[PDB]
Design an enzyme around this catalytic site. Structure first.
Site: not given
Lengths: 356, 360, 348, 345
Positions: B303, B42, B271-273, B187, B229
């Site tokens: 993110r 990040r 939210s993965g991307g 998740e 999740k």
């Protein structure tokens, strides 16, 4: 398995439409699909000989009741024979029922078969040629089916072979019906015989519905076009503890809400021998239990809708009205229970408080 | 088997209360549990050295934000390091979070392990010592955990062996948290890598979910005491079909209502991307999807809650303020989306419009 | 997965050789992998202080025995510590054994862990980092591993969760070991505790084996590269009926021929609890039992090969000879039992 | 349950004895249980009208062959119509076979059923009322059953669902046979259709069988009174790579010894599609294969025992002796191959 969709959008739209139509505004199901033998058991109680004709006569009284009956009753499940029977003026029953606005259903299982190496446990037969049978029934005016499995609590029951194997026959059953336009009712009844208590039933009932729904997914069944007829959650027959409609309600919606997908549109309980009054009081608490209930919670009753009428009939043409009156009253009561609007009212004589 | 209940009524009451408190009134989760490597990816984006000190500074900004953040954020997941770091005055991060009325979670899984004879599929390590670790974290102010499984779509992916084994591991993991008063977040992520379209994703996801819950059931987990999740249902990364949030939501809410039981109190999406704005538009669309939705539907955003703040930070302490306004702005938008009220103007805010966070 | 093969032909060749090498000709397995506490229980019987030196001294005696003994023992399972200990001269035990002609193995599991919602059932811990651990042991001259699961017969045990979860961990461990050249020794033990009888254990042992196998199969484990160390079909510890070696043999090979694939090269009984004399006679009967027995049947014993040796040692150096003698004696009886020779007729 | 045994020892004893006696000394099985349609195909071949008369007539030549065929053939699989058909003298075929010391078996399955949501996969019907049929057949001279499941190799097949479901159907069937004194021959065929090579087929053959046997284990089936009739492992039909019998054997035995339990007494390879000779060569090899083989390894052939005989008959009654000769000839060749003693010359 994978890619290669079992159904078209259109097939789904049809089955989801049928399914939601039957539990649409507090309405339920009248379960009149007793087989020859089972119906003889019923007729025995009122000391009436188990004849086709007697069977035809009692059903005709129930099916010829005022169309108002539409406002409680969403569908009627028939046994094969009765599907092809008639009135006095051979109007076939099935058309007496469709014309009043009631959806017709059909018993599609063909009973138990023992499962070797088990404490008396069984599975259910009827998958052979089910497709072709379902197609003809679709043609003859039927829009949903019913398949009942029976699981017991006892030394070593319900075994695993038992829950998985009955979950897979259910799943095949469900799968075939959908390929023919019928909404399948999956009935995984856990039998109230014995002396277990409330928690014990609740647990087995949870482990049996988790099986059913995962099998059900493994076979690509379309939850939205299906209906579940579970047992409510109670202590067994021989349990001495005493429970309340409200305790049956919590245990019962607890179990369901942990295992029945929200996609299934409606859950219509089997009454199995509870008196008519309890059948109603229990369903009514179920609709007021303070837990997440994403589907309609209704009835598919056989005895809880036909005891007091049987008794008023006693096999005498002359009783038509009383017979009618009874069934209508039970029917209305269960409709309010279905809407969490029932208040101890409804039928009251020993037959409503009966026990079955 | 049976009549050997895993939890007492009073343990259930405690996990249920925890679990619901985190998703209570549109609130969501800030997923700040990037490990050192992940975090490195990040900060690389903003060209900041991936230092334990740089990490401790960017998280200090985020957690020292105005109190009111507890209107949007019901819980915060931390990476072990962070659970033991301090402010710029020796006040513990976990204590700062806890006094502002925010529940603290901890990442419990310990990365993947390859599944032999599989086309590049994994499982997830972390169960050995799991109990003794939760016990201690509970003692340390932690009330919930997180365990991430990774499934992909591809030639002979996701296999039965991978789905099965990752659900079981998830299973053990949720069991163990529950025995130690931590609410497990489960998740099983379906990653977006590849070109399948939405229909395919939806199907794998329904497949994965059904195995997860039957598994949790085999293991006696207490659903009421859990959070889920999962991934929203979307097209693969390289797919070229373009879809609408609303298409996204229909697929997502369809799959979830056919496999996740109504006893699960909330479902907080990774939210993965997806851009910060897309994670907002989608979650919002999910809350207005006309299907049964027995459970909270919110966010658990890594993110998507942090892009903009990172960029604002630049790794400069003088940017504290900007940093905190970015964070706060996405935390509020998300909480509105968690209630089906985010009527974004499409977001303007490049920071928020771009793909996200050394992702792939 | 579906193509995407676990291992290459060569891994296979390798592992298959290890596997058959250890049960090559009547031989068996010395299970010296007791753990710190366990080993201390053994020392406690002979009133010797559980001490790392006491422990290193005992094994030293067992491992320094007359080379020969590679004609009965074909592999010796060691507990981690012991893998890096020496003898009274830096010779590393793991070298003394290799040079004697014996395959050295390691215990890889890390004990139990409670399965919530069960009647005291467990799983086993140990997969986190197993791979890395495997690579180094293989590099430190270990050619095979051992993982024990424990299942019991009791009110609602063994449960399906227990069985399923134990078989899967075992499958993870077995897959993992091949990936690094060890041949995994799959030990799903059905404990004898309780009062059930033979036929109750038969039934429960045949169900546990069906489980494990099925799993190994799901996990694409290479059976030809494996070894099994199952309990013998016997009545429970508290059962009051009494039975014969031959009755334990039939119970046992019956179960094994219905569930353990002919591809597994050898199955190596644990004895846990049986006297030294019984573990030799039952193994012996096992090999004479008239069913089909596609695989070597042999031993991989811990107490049954050491109990008298400990008694003889008494924790006294002076006792060395007595001590080796005993161990050397039980090791031949069981090799001979492994061949169905052991004319029995009571030994020591 | 568990505990609550499915069978008594007596019942076991009988199923065991029947199971072994069929594969008893290098013996095998003549599978003449083709259905009306299938037989039609086979007669199509020699240009004879698919007629119950024709069918009835062609089998009557094979079953009247000299008693000495009981040296090679331990049992025969009949299709229902035929179980009740007679010779030209009103003697029922089943009694003719029984009197020459051949055990008679009945097809029990009832064909295929489409498994929605799958790429053309199926399950098999026939469990409804199967027990009452088993019992009836037992009373009509039958001692073992037959149930064929079919899986194929193709885009997403065989699926988990197909696998598991046919396994469960096989399990049930096997169980219900046992309960009525027949020995269930389990037949999980992996169809050869398609381009795949050897190793592929072997990989599916191994997954199908591990599924078959665990499910028979869930269902308390007693393996010592069962028989397995699997495909051998070979490349698929449109696969261009050529292979040697030794290659088919190593792949077949490798698979079989990894998954089929040593209790199962005999494994009787279907040959589906293989030329008579290839079916003999491959079985032969199978028997010399240098791997553990706890079970007999034999045949249960239909085309492989009848092709040359059917051509000789030509639907001509005058060809009775040629017709029997041919059949007799392959039956002896396969018997030798079941003993890894076959040689061309």
């Amino acid at each position: 398995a994978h890619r290669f969709p079992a159904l078209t959008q259109e097939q789904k739209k049809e089955l989801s439409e049928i399914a939601q139509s039957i539990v649409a505004n507090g309405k339920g199901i009248l379960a009149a699909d007793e087989s020859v033998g089972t119906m003889g058991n019923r007729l025995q109680r009122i000391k009436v000989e188990n004849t086709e004709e007697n069977r035809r006569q009692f059903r005709e009284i129930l099916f010829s009741v005022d169309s108002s009956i539409n406002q409680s009753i969403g569908g009627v499940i028939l046994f094969h024979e009765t599907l092809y029977q008639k009135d006095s003026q051979g109007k076939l029953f099935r058309n007496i029922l469709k014309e009043k606005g009631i959806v017709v259903g059909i018993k599609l299982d063909q009973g138990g078969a023992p499962l070797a190496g088990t404490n008396k446990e069984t599975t259910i037969q009827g998958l052979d040629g089910l497709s072709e049978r379902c197609a003809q029934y679709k043609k003859d005016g039927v829009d949903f089916g019913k398949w009942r499995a029976v699981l017991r609590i006892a030394d070593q029951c319900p075994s695993s072979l038992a829950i998985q194997e009955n979950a897979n026959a259910l799943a095949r059953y469900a799968s075939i019906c959908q390929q023919n336009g019928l909404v399948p009712i999956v009935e995984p009844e856990v039998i109230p015989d014995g002396d277990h208590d409330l928690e014990h039933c609740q647990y087995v009932t949870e482990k049996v519905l988790a099986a059913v729904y995962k099998a059900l997914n493994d076979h690509h069944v379309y939850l939205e076009g299906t209906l579940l007829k579970p047992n409510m959650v109670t202590a067994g027959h021989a349990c001495t503890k005493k429970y309340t409609p409200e305790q049956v309600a919590m245990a019962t919606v607890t179990a369901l809400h942990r295992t029945v997908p929200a996609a299934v549109p409606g859950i219509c309980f089997l009454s199995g021998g509870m008196s008519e009054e309890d059948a109603t009081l229990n369903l009514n608490a179920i609709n007021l239990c303070p837990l997440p209930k994403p589907w309609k919670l209704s009835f598919s009753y056989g005895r809880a809708l036909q005891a007091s009428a049987l008794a008023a009939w006693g096999g005498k043409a002359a009783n038509k009205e009383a017979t009618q009156e009874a069934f209508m009253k039970r029917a209305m009561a269960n409709c309010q229970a279905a809407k969490g609007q029932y208040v101890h009212t409804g039928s009251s004589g020993a037959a409503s408080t009966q026990s079955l």
